[PDB]
A and B are shown apart, each in its own frame.
Chain A
């Protein structure tokens, strides 16, 4: 728990200035949030989610994983273009069934799906 504006001023009851009241309180705020930040780092140090978000090695992995998986989705998109799944496909509710068939055809190709695997959608 953090101290309010009144509680900090109760400590220094001697030379109570007008301008220097906000000086020492904001210095307390920065040094309180310094320790609270430091206590969080030591608490959630070894956890994977925190490691993954900030650690040099682990952040290097997730950029490499995501960029690899993102390239798989691009090669799927470019395969759908040249094969011809976006030919007579408009983004309207009238062609809602055609969009669902396309998205399933995309997800098939994402999972290493062959041209034979696409035949079930017919």
Chain B
């Protein structure tokens, strides 16, 4: 059989994608061009009217210049895309300060990398034991085989110590898209053209003698940059939630039922949902919960949709 270049992909880039334009609309537009793969969209930017930047990626065997020119001046909902041919990644393997290879920092970086994997595996539930069946309390997750016997190496330049560190960082970078040595995450990598693009690496051996003051300075600077990557989604206080006006679930359900139980005349009640006439106030109440059981729970979702927005501390808002 013929072996394919799956690692290689040429791609477009889009500047202006309005927030009203759905992902499905951009996929539907780019599907008619053969050799289409996938569309990625950036986190919207509030300063630029919440417009998004896009990346349409293709199989390498395709005229990307023709696709760009053909797509040029096509406007989803009267909004110009303005596509361009996205460049290839050139400087793939970047580097940082050489001090990182020193044996005291290596021990410190194993501690931190192991702590990162422990956190990220638990948050994502990545090693779920039998994910189809429900989770019992006596069930445990499967162990990460990298994390087995790590603190043996910590306690009692070394090559065998670095091999343990590299398997931690290679895991972090390939699985969770965490570039360790740069102290940054590439969160939306799996949709972008370059699935696993940039990696950072330990530099060359320093020329001069490595000072112990400079060793402690690096380890201080490194951990201060890593702690932002372990950020919890900050929920506001329950006073602040009630002050800003968090909606109650069953109150809106009660407001929905009373609004859809209107009195036409004496002993004559009607609901706009079905349009069946009843002869009582709580006759229409029992009608809605039985017949329109899916509708009342759809209101509960719209309440949680408003509450989850309120709950977030750093909400999207106008600058």
- Name A residues whose Cβ lies closer than 8 Å to a Cβ of B: 30, 33-34, 36-38, 40-41, 44, 46-50, 53-57, 59, 67, 69-74, 76-77, 80-81, 86, 89-93, 96, 99-100, 103-108, 110-113, 116-121
B166 A91 Cβ-Cβ under 8 A:
yes
- Choose among A53, A73, A100, A120 the residue that contacts B3 (Cβ–Cβ < 8 A): A120
| Chain A positions within 8 Å of B304 at CB level | 56
A107 B6 Cβ-Cβ under 8 A:
yes
User: Of residues 114 to 128 in B, which have CB atoms within 8 Å of A's CB atoms?
Assistant: 124-126
| Chain B positions within 8 Å of A54 at CB level | 305, 308-309, 312
A25 to chain B, nearest CB (A): 16
* A-B pairs with lowest CB-CB distance, top 6: A104-B7, A111-B6, A96-B93, A54-B308, A108-B6, A107-B195
- Choose among B3, B5, B194, B317 the residue that contacts A37 (Cβ–Cβ < 8 A): B317
- Choose among A30, A44, A92, A111 the residue that contacts B50 (Cβ–Cβ < 8 A): A44
| Chain B positions within 8 Å of A50 at CB level | 19, 316
Which B-chain residue is minimally distant from A101 (CB atoms)? B7
B209 on the interface (CB 8 Å rule)? no
B190 on the interface (CB 8 Å rule)? yes
B280 on the interface (CB 8 Å rule)? no
Total A-B Cβ pairs within 8 A: 143
A73 B201 Cβ-Cβ under 8 A:
no
A82 to chain B, nearest CB (A): 10
A99 B201 Cβ-Cβ under 8 A:
yes
Q: Determine the main DSSP class of A at the interface with B.
A: helix
Between A41, A92, A99, the greatest number of chain B beta carbons within 10 A of the residue's beta carbon is seen for A92
- 23 residue pairs of the A-B complex, CB under 8 angstroms, read A30-B244, A37-B244, A37-B315, A40-B318, A41-B309, A47-B19, A47-B20, A49-B44, A50-B316, A54-B308, A54-B312, A70-B175, A73-B174, A74-B175, A90-B162, A91-B181, A93-B203, A93-B204, A96-B92, A100-B93, A103-B196, A117-B4, A117-B6
- Choose among A49, A106, A120 the residue that contacts B174 (Cβ–Cβ < 8 A): A106
- Name B residues whose Cβ lies closer than 8 Å to a Cβ of A: 1, 3-7, 19-20, 22-23, 41, 43-44, 50, 52, 92-93, 95, 101, 124-126, 145, 162-163, 166-167, 169-171, 174-176, 181, 190, 194-196, 199, 201-204, 243-245, 301, 304-306, 308-310, 312, 315-318
A116 B176 Cβ-Cβ under 8 A:
no
A92 to chain B, nearest CB (A): 6
A113 to B4, CA, bound (A): 8
B79 to chain A, nearest CB (A): 13
Which A-chain residue is minimally distant from B173 (CB atoms)? A103
| Chain B positions within 8 Å of A90 at CB level | 162-163, 166
Between A69, A81, A107, A118, the greatest number of chain B beta carbons within 10 A of the residue's beta carbon is seen for A107
A41-B306 in contact given A48-B23, A73-B175, A99-B201 (Cβ < 8 Å): yes
Given contacts A37-B317, A49-B43, A77-B170, list 20 more A-B pairs with CB under 8 A. Answer: A30-B244, A46-B20, A47-B19, A47-B20, A50-B19, A53-B316, A54-B308, A56-B304, A57-B301, A59-B308, A72-B190, A77-B171, A77-B174, A90-B162, A91-B170, A93-B95, A99-B92, A105-B7, A107-B195, A116-B1
| Chain B positions within 8 Å of A108 at CB level | 6-7
A19 to B301, CA, bound (A): 42
A96 B174 Cβ-Cβ under 8 A:
no
- Choose among A55, A57, A70, A120 the residue that contacts B5 (Cβ–Cβ < 8 A): A120
A92-B305 in contact given A37-B310, A67-B125, A110-B195 (Cβ < 8 Å): no
A49-B52 in contact given A37-B310, A106-B196, A117-B3 (Cβ < 8 Å): yes
A44 B317 Cβ-Cβ under 8 A:
no
